[PDB]
Amino acid sequence: MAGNFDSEERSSWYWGRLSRQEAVALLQGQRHGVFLVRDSSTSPGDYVLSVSENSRVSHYIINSSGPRPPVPPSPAQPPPGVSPSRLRIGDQEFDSLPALLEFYKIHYLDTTTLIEPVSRSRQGSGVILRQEEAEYVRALFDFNGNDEEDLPFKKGDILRIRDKPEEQWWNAEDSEGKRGMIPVPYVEKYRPASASVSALIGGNQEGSHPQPLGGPEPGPYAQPSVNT
């Protein structure tokens, strides 16, 4: 952090093979301007460029045909020395990704302009709202915390789980009064004398219309250039 933000680092600006839901789950809502890149599960060979526009981000499918003529591997390229590559985002193509990342940093590719890399940024809960809650959990690790919002606590601490955003963290509060997202696989369920009722997490049972994972989208990630 601090000094790990760039377009030619392929470490902070490139998430690699991030899920279409996890690549936007973190980017979407980072700050005033942010962007990232995925590999598209369906298009493992084609990378994508996301750019936090509105509620969600802006998934854009890029194409890397690789510097190779039509039919051959590369018979005529080394000699001239100047051998370009094959990389196209929406409609405009150049060499690589970072080459087109700076091309729309202030040119508006589809409606959001290109900004700085999201990277880990920090934490950011992202839990849900409007739902019952209850206390019951006894931490099991000496954590420190990511920020002043997250929930650290040490081993042997009971938090008030506000909700189950995931299996890795369960929104909870510490016995001090502060709250945040705790480490699920680090704490557990514990009922000292307040079992309470309800659950919420057991609201559904994965019927036929919901299904696990999430609605598949075996298709392209659109293109920043459609009619502009």
28 and 12, same structural domain?
yes
As a whole number of angstroms, the distance between CA 104 and CA 38 comes to 18
Half-sphere exposure in the Cβ direction for 64 (13 Å, CA): 15
4 and 100, same structural domain?
yes
165 and 128, same structural domain?
yes
Q: Determine the residue type at 197.
A: V
Any idea what the Cα angle at residue 37 is, between residues 32 and 38, rounded to 5°?
135
Q: Are 101 and 35 in contact (CB under 8 A)?
A: yes
As a whole number of angstroms, the distance between CA 224 and CA 123 comes to 28
Dihedral sign for Cα atoms in the order 148, 159, 185, 154:
positive
28 and 63, same structural domain?
yes
CA dihedral 81, 98, 44, 39 (to 10 degrees): 170
Experimental method: NMR
Q: Are 141 and 183 in contact (CB under 8 A)?
A: yes
In the numeric block, the tokens 């606590």 are attached to 153
64 and 136, same structural domain?
no
Q: How many domains does the chain have?
A: 2
In sequence order, the β-bridge partners of residue 117 are 35
Please give the residue range of the domain that contains residue 59.
1-121+206-228
- Which CATH number fits the domain that encloses residue 148? 2.30.30.40
60 and 144, same structural domain?
no
211 and 101, same structural domain?
yes
3-state secondary structure the chain: CCCCCCCCCCCCCCCCCCCCCHHHHHHCCCCCCCEEEECCCCCCCCCEEECCCCCCCCCEECECCCCCCCCCCCCCCCCCCCCCCCEECCCCEECCHHHHHCCCCCCCCCCCCCCCECCCCCCCCCCCCCCCCCCCCECCCCCCCCCCCCCCCCCCCECCCCECCCCCEEEEECCCCCEEEEEHHHCCCCCCCCCCCCCCCCCCCCCCCCCCCCCCCCCCCCCCCCCC
Q: Return the structure tokens found at 191.
A: 């009922």
Q: Are 65 and 89 in contact (CB under 8 A)?
A: no
Q: Choose among 105, 140, 82, 93: nearest CA to 34.
A: 105
Sequence-distant (6+) residues with CB within 8 A of 72 are none
10 and 45, same structural domain?
yes
Q: Are 177 and 153 in contact (CB under 8 A)?
A: no
As a whole number of angstroms, the distance between CA 42 and CA 55 comes to 24
